[PDB]
Design a protein around this nucleic acid. Structure first.
Ligand SMILES: [Mg+2]
Lengths: 407, 555
DNA sequence: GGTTGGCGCCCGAACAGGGACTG
DNA sequence: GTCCCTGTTCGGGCGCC
């Protein structure tokens, strides 16, 4: 608490100009309550139209709580803030945090406020609280302290951060800690119970300054699968030739040449085909290739992480992470038993994002299987994080809907 | 006065200087009329006369306003606005009568000479220089700059809404139980008080306002239901719109049609059942707005339907946050929907239509999904929560579709309502192939050069067609082959196509497309008793998508 | 009858994707 | 890359303030 560090927008970009979206009474009551206090404290100052910039805000109860958490969707500003979350940031990603038995997710943004923000950078941090039924004009605010949600925030409170743990870290050469933005990721292999009470003991190596479950090495990869049948049909073989055809771009060796010649001429769809010798011994082999991992796929921390999702139905959604199309760093399923399609899919992007942070230390840009209007009407009702991944909306072919089918 | 309030700092966009625009000529009858205006305004510190050391000038015309034959000053700051900084606009939306809770006592009052009661930042003041034209070339006209918020400058609205807020805050703190709706210089003020004490609180507001330089004339609707606010009449227990009058016109120009759609839309907020889809189709014509579009007799039906609804007395009521919100939707024509939001039967907070075509291809369960999305976001704005829904669709149909559809789709809490017509899926694709039915291997093929293509099929029972299409494309020949096969198959068919595009459209179960072909394909689909649609890798020599492909590729 | 800001409904023009092409 | 085709956004008319 004193004087501050110079910042700048990526060489050429201008500040954020995003509209505030409508909010529910509850998210607003919460918000003016929160912002009244940060005004009394001097973390946010009140501004007016002369500031051309805006970023959205809503608020989330981080779980089953009465405490509301302000979330400023700095997505745009972060995207526009100068290269230094890679360039001035020191953090290598401790490859082994994903290897641990237990990891706990730690919210610590409310510790960013301690630090003054450049005098000239404040204006970009501007955001507007709505009024319901538009009884008043928007009430505008600006930041005088490192904002939670902004990516410049941990890239500054880092020297301090690297300090704040000097003891607890030294005193624990086998508990690993990672700082991605608002959240702090700490986990150890310790037993289920003495882990919990070792995290709790970090709150104290914390609280003296100020101020949920998740087990990593068990997000099992999900395989690409072929239906075995005692009897095949023209339609069954044509679907088989369809999947393997495609898969043959992710796996080079997959051949379909013997199966495609069982489709010799214009058979009716339900006619049964006696699988021949080479036939059965081509898909028998093909089903072997689908066992082996993809060879030669490596994360580029420079390049962009891309999650991609498909609705399989029955609360089961399949996903790939990948940077070059077809070279998936991972593939998985979010199986839910037996239903809100939208809560489902928003939760699917939180589980995935975490994994991404945990495994690669950044977040994907998602390509979602939902219509913009739909996603946007409802998704903040189920969000629970402090980060927000980029996304964009996709109109998928029903084919890829059908390349990750189980049974 | 001048509000004692602090100016709001204003800058020109970087690198740009003020306006240097030539005062263009005006009648002496304005030139006198403007001198009359620019004299009292000068008398009252709103404008300062400037010398020749102000390089700038922007054009100021004048026009008589609203049946008075009184002139009203007006500057054209179009250039200053270009050079002015950006602002963040603070007016986010428009207050709606239905988010109004029933108060015991109501007052509406407007703020007089509002923009001119607010100081403009002095260092920006000089860019507002305008000159009032001597009757010709003759005299160098009078130079003036602006001391308050000019009419017609990009910044003035915002900076005034902002100031208004910042002035009302003190009063709002102290009267937390006085509700003040604040639209530009308009004030609705409501309380759960007996008029006497209510009335006091008001004068107490007007004194606060007066102490800040804001005069509250007497266009004050005192003890006066109906109050006229934001376009509506407010009565103590019901609200309504001030009368709408659709232009009864002989020869509709297109823009005349946009003017008609406009009033209907505005009417659609309290008059249930307003239809506009037929009239917002006559519009589908890259256009001269001057152009004269002939009235479609289908639209003709619609307008007639509306003009009739408009003769009905309607009203809304006010919001009780004690109770819940409840929306009823109604499928009321080809992609025209209607709804009403209530808290007690036959008492309509408001109503509304949906009738948007999202997609080149859509169906009822999509749209009724879209219209529910719209009503959700609207409800959040007016009441800040989402209504319970009552929809004319049976849980059955929804799940059939949430099932076949491969993009997540959703609807909240909703009770079935048997308010027919009910939303139905017009046909359904089989999930597995149809035993023993004829199997059409279809394909088509175009020629990017000549735009000539072929579409046709080959089948297990032995028959084949090939047909040649002029001025077509691959995706249309793909779609041709699937319609050809549909035309020629009995009441049960299997179709194998190599087109990821054709597969995509039809698997989504359209019942309505801007494409005549997909409509020709839909009419067939509705006629079969079963259809199975299979996909296959093109050019991979599947039996027998290779023969269809071999016959069809003379393109 | 030549000016400003807001929200809404429309339209089309510009885009950005994705698939399918091409010799 | 070029076609298409689909989905956006963005202006612009109108409505109302
Ligand atoms: Mg083809």
């Amino acid at each position: 608490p004193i004087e501050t560090v110079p910042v700048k927008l990526k060489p050429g970009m201008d500040g954020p100009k995003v509209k505030q979206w409508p909010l529910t009474e509850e998210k607003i009551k919460a918000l003016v309550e929160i912002c009244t206090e940060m005004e009394k404290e001097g973390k946010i100052s009140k501004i007016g139209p002369e500031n051309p910039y805006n970023t959205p805000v809503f608020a989330i109860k981080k779980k089953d709580s009465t405490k509301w958490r302000k979330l400023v969707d700095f997505r745009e500003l972060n995207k526009r803030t100068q290269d230094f979350w890679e360039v001035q940031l020191g953090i290598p990603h401790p490859a082994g945090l994903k290897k641990k038995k237990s990891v706990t997710v730690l919210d610590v943004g409310d510790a960013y406020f301690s630090v003054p923000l450049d005098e000239d950078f404040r204006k970009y941090t501007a955001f507007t609280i709505p009024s319901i039924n538009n009884e008043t004009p928007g009430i505008r605010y600006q930041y005088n302290v490192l904002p939670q949600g902004w990516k410049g925030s941990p890239a500054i409170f880092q020297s301090s951060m690297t300090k704040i743990l000097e003891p607890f870290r030294k005193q624990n050469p086998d508990i690993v800690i990672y700082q991605y933005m608002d959240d702090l990721y700490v986990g150890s292999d310790l037993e289920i119970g003495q882990h919990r009470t070792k995290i709790e003991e970090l709150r104290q190596h914390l609280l003296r300054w100020g101020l949920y479950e998740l087990h990593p090495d068990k997000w099992t990869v999900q395989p690409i699968v072929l239906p075995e049948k005692d009897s095949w049909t023209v339609n069954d073989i044509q679907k088989l030739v369809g999947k393997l055809n495609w898969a043959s771009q992710i796996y080079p060796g997959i051949k379909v040449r013997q199966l495609s010649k069982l489709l010799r001429g214009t058979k009716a769809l339900t006619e049964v085909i006696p699988l021949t010798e080479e036939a059965e011994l081509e898909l028998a082999e093909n089903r072997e290739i689908l066992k082996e991992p993809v060879h030669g796929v490596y994360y580029d921390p420079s390049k962009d992480l891309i999650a991609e999702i498909q609705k399989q139905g029955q609360g089961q959604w399949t996903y790939q992470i990948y940077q070059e199309p077809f070279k998936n760093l991972k593939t998985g399923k979010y199986a839910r038993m037996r239903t809100n399609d939208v809560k489902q899919l928003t939760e699917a992007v939180q589980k995935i994002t975490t994994e991404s942070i945990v495994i690669w230390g950044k977040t994907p840009k998602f390509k979602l299987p939902i219509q913009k209007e739909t996603w946007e009407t409802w998704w903040t009702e189920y969000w629970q994080a402090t980060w927000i991944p980029e996304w964009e909306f996709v109109n998928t072919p029903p084919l890829v809907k059908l390349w990750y089918q189980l049974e | 006065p001048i509000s004692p309030i602090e100016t709001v700092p204003v800058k020109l966009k970087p690198g740009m200087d003020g306006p240097k625009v030539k005062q263009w000529p005006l009648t002496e009858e304005k030139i006198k009329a403007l001198v009359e205006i620019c004299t009292e305004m000068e008398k009252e510190g709103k404008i300062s006369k400037i010398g020749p050391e102000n390089p700038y000038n922007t054009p100021v015309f004048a026009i008589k306003k609203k049946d008075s034959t009184k002139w009203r000053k007006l500057v054209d700051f179009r250039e200053l606005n270009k050079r002015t900084q950006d602002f963040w606009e603070v007016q986010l939306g428009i207050p709606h009568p239905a988010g109004l809770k029933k108060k015991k006592s109501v007052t509406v009052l407007d703020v007089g000479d509002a923009y001119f009661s607010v100081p403009l930042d002095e260092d920006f003041r000089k860019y507002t220089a305008f000159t009032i034209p001597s009757i010709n070339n003759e005299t160098p006209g009078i130079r003036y700059q602006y001391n308050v918020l000019p009419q017609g400058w990009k910044g003035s609205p915002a900076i005034f809404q902002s100031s208004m807020t910042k002035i009302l805050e003190p009063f709002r703190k102290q009267n937390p139980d006085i509700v003040i709706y604040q639209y530009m210089d308009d004030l609705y003020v409501g309380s759960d008080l007996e008029i006497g004490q209510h009335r006091t609180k008001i004068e107490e507001l007007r004194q606060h306002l007066l102490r800040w330089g804001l005069t509250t004339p007497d266009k004050k609707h005192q003890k006066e239901p109906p109050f006229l606010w934001m376009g509506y009449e407010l009565h103590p227990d019901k609200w309504t719109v001030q009368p709408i009058v659709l232009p009864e016109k002989d020869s509709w120009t297109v823009n005349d049609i946009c003017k008609l759609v406009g009033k209907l839309n505005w009417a659609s907020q309290i008059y249930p059942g307003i239809k506009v889809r037929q009239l917002s189709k006559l519009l589908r014509g890259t256009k001269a707005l001057t152009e004269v579009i002939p009235l479609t007799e289908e639209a003709e039906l619609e307008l007639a339907e509306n003009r009739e609804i408009l003769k009905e007395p309607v009203h809304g009521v006010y919001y009780d946050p004690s109770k819940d919100l409840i929306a009823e939707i109604q499928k009321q024509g080809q992609g025209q929907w209607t709804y009403q939001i209530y808290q007690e039967p036959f008492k309509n907070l408001k109503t509304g239509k949906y009738a948007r075509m999202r997609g080149a291809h859509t169906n009822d369960v999509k749209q009724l999904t879209e219209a529910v999305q719209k009503i959700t976001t609207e409800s959040i704005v007016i009441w800040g929560k989402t209504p319970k829904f009552k929809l004319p669709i049976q849980k059955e149909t929804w799940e059939t579709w949430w099932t076949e559809y491969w993009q997540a789709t959703w609807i909240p809490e909703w009770e079935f309502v048997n308010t027919p017509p009910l939303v139905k899926l017009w046909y359904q694709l089989e999930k597995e192939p149809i035993v023993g039915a004829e199997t059409f291997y279809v394909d088509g093929a175009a020629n990017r050069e000549t735009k000539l293509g072929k579409a046709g099929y080959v089948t297990n029972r032995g028959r084949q067609k090939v047909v040649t299409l002029t001025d077509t494309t691959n995706q249309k020949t793909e779609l041709q082959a699937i319609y050809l096969a549909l035309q020629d198959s009995g009441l049960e068919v299997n179709i194998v196509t190599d087109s990821q595009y054709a597969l995509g459209i039809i698997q989504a179960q359209p019942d309505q497309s801007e494409s005549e072909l997909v409509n020709q394909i839909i009419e067939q689909l509705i006629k079969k008793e079963k259809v199975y649609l299979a996909w296959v890798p093109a050019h991979k020599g599947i039996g027998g998508n290779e023969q269809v492909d071999k016959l069809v590729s003379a393109g």
